From a paper:
Sirtuins are NAD+-dependent protein lysine deacylases that sense the cellular nutrient status, regulate energy metabolism and stress responses, and have been implicated in aging processes and aging-related diseases. Sirtuins feature differing substrate acyl selectivities. Here, we analyse modulation of Sirt6 and other isoforms by quercetin and its derivatives in activity and binding assays and through crystal structure analyses of modulator complexes of Sirt6 and Sirt2. Our results hence reveal sites and mechanisms for Sirtuin modulation by quercetin derivatives and provide helpful insights for Sirt6 modulator development.
To identify Sirt6’s quercetin binding site and interaction details, we determined a crystal structure of a Sirt6/ADP-ribose/quercetin complex at 1.84 Å resolution. Well-defined electron density for the quercetin ligand revealed the distal end of Sirt6’s extended acyl binding channel as binding site. Asp116 normally forms a hydrogen bond to the NAM moiety of NAD+ bound in the so-called “C-site”, illustrating that catechol pocket and C-site partly overlap. The quercetin chromen-4-one system contributes to complex formation through hydrophobic contacts with funnel surface patches formed by Phe64/82/86 and Val70/115, and Met136/157. Comparison of the Sirt6/quercetin complex with a Sirt6 complex with the pyrrolo[1,2-a]quinoxaline-based activator UBCS039 shows that they share most of their binding sites. It thus appears that the buried catechol group of quercetin functions as an anchor in Sirt6 binding, while the chromen-4-one provides smaller and non-specific binding contributions and might be particularly amenable for modifications to increase compound affinity. Thus, quercetin stimulates the deacetylation activity of Sirt6 and inhibits Sirt6-dependent demyristoylations, as observed for UBCS039 and consistent with their binding to the remote end of the Sirt6 acyl channel.
Numbering used by the authors: 10 to 169, 177 to 298
The structure:
Amino acid sequence: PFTADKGKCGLPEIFDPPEELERKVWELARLVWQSSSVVFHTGAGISTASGIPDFRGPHGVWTMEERGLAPKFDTTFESARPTQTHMALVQLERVGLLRFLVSQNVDGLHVRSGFPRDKLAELHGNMFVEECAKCKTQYVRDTVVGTMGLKATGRLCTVACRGELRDTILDWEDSLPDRDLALADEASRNADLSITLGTSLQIRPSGNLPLATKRRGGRLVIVNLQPTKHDRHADLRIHGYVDEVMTRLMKHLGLEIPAWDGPRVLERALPPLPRPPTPKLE
Ligand SMILES: Nc1ncnc2c1ncn2[C@@H]1O[C@H](COP(=O)(O)OP(=O)(O)OC[C@H]2O[C@H](O)[C@H](O)[C@@H]2O)[C@@H](O)[C@H]1O
Ligand SMILES: O=c1c(O)c(-c2ccc(O)c(O)c2)oc2cc(O)cc(O)c12
Ligand SMILES: [Zn+2]
């Protein structure tokens, strides 16, 4: 834990100049239009624009620690709002353009945005989620569960059980929840398009799931300000802020980014909404 390898921290950021950024986001649109099964992979980069620092960015938690400085939070977890990127992903699922969403984020924003939990793998856990050690029932709380490392929180299960509730935050030693990783793995293998957003892809095996898409000739898009572990495997690398990339993508797809109603939990995806007809792609 104290000597846990925190990987490559504080690499220089890359900014695609505007003409190139505009051309890459057009190519991403073309890829989304052409794909049968689109899977998104998110990391801490999608939450930096809500005030939650990442881990390995220039002011990330691990980067600052290396330099003997502290990360800065501009929000609590409870007062953090979903970004434009978070809400774009909600809409993409609703119109059937996203098959599944794999996140390394513990910040609870995908759940709180109203993204359906049955299309989400939360590989590293959720700050707001406790789980019955007996029956495995999960409770999505309105405040952060005050423990980390799969510890007893002190609350008990209420299923019609009295099982001990534990946090879902993996420590360095803990392996990924089997359900989340198994669904994330099946989605990534069966996808013909994996898109990574604000992850450096340094964690194994979370960071490696997008590569599974390349099996049977799937395509891989990496959107990130820094270099990533798997840059050389990407069909398309977009170096720009994920909110800029996603608002431009949504405009190309003719989709609006929906309103956030405040924190709301959706267990099961709703029936798909209508979406714009597809352009002719030669
Ligand atoms: N607004 C932004 N737009 C685009 N890219 C961004 C933005 N902000 C940050 N980035 C990029 O976002 C990337 C975020 O990379 P990392 O900080 O490694 O986070 P992870 O989610 O992959 O960390 C994985 C696990 O490691 C930890 O131990 C935990 O257990 C994590 O769950 C950077 O490369 C930024 O350049
Ligand atoms: O529990 C914690 C936590 O999860 C995170 C964290 C950091 C960056 C992220 O991008 C993120 O999603 C979470 O930081 C912390 C920093 C502390 O001083 C104390 C904590 O207890 C946490
Ligand atoms: Zn129980």
